[PDB]
Design a protein around this ligand. Structure first.
Ligand SMILES: Nc1ncnc2c1ncn2[C@@H]1O[C@H](CSCC[C@H](N)C(=O)O)[C@@H](O)[C@H]1O
Ligand SMILES: Nc1ncnc2c1ncn2[C@@H]1O[C@H](CSCC[C@H](N)C(=O)O)[C@@H](O)[C@H]1O
Lengths: 152, 145
């Protein structure tokens, strides 16, 4: 990857989602960060040697380890779509941070960072999209902006 | 008033994939077409068909795109904003893809998601979400919030 992209899963609950996201990360040279506690064990079958997976014990651990990272929070509280920012700077570590399948991201985090919160536009017919689908959309939007460098 | 978008699943195998795709379709006002036989027993506009040929003859005017690793152009290389057109994104089965004859006779409409050499393919539901939201992006998400 020339642009450094990261996907962060806060306390993921369903291993099929994390496995599918790891597949998307391996397909795009994106680093996958898993914030413990997980809803599954790492020997779960539904859940890798070509994907960069990092485990963290807290969001704070991750924020302090990338003091220079550019963080975006994917949440329905966002007031702007995922396509409204540029993800092409070659000197930035970009993070897309996703909440738990049932409960989302910590409310305080969203409230303090509304200007970096991204919403996927949807009808009113559905509460949210599947976590792995949302992550795939975000990653391929950033790759689109880079005209899919180093991919084929 | 709105772009008519359609997602077609050819003989889908895994219910969880079809369920997530139907959720994405309900989220975006996209019509979901399922081509039987399904691998499973059965706000989303879902239409069942007994064959792809039934679908092609029922939309003689439709604009059909086939989503396959054999495509030599990315999904973003076509415009999906014409308000007079029915756009179809057609996806293969999770194990074996689309009928080979279909791909060979339609390579000019065949779309591939760029990936690394590390992975054989993306999850089916993830691929369909990427295609739908690409079309929506091109429209600046008119009708949505
Ligand atoms: N339409 C959307 N806009 C922004 N983020 C979304 C989204 N759909 C799903 N997500 C992401 O997927 C994660 C899990 S879905 C969580 C939704 C849950 N029903 C709730 O009400 O809390 C969310 O935390 C967010 O990161
Ligand atoms: N990287 C990619 N580019 C284009 N289409 C893809 C894709 N990844 C998955 N798909 C779509 O998702 C469907 C299921 S993937 C199934 C293909 C299977 N691995 C095989 O050997 O045939 C495919 O038929 C295709 O429609």
């Amino acid at each position: 990857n020339i642009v450094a992209l990261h996907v962060v899963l806060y306390q993921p609950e369903i291993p099929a989602n994390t496995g599918n996201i790891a597949r998307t990360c391996a397909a795009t040279n994106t680093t996958l960060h898993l914030i413990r506690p997980l809803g599954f064990s790492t020997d779960d079958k539904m859940l890798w040697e070509f994907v960069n997976v990092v485990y963290h014990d807290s969001l704070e651990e991750l924020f302090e380890a990338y003091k220079k990272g550019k963080f975006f929070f994917i949440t329905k509280f966002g007031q702007q779509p995922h396509t409204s920012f540029d993800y092409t700077d070659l000197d930035e570590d970009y993070f897309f941070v996703f909440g738990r399948e049932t409960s989302g991201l910590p409310k305080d985090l969203i409230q303090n960072n509304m200007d970096r919160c991204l919403r996927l536009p949807m009808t009113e017919h559905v509460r949210s999209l599947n976590l792995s689908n949302t992550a795939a959309i975000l990653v391929y939007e950033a790759l689109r902006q880079q005209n899919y460098r180093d991919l084929k």
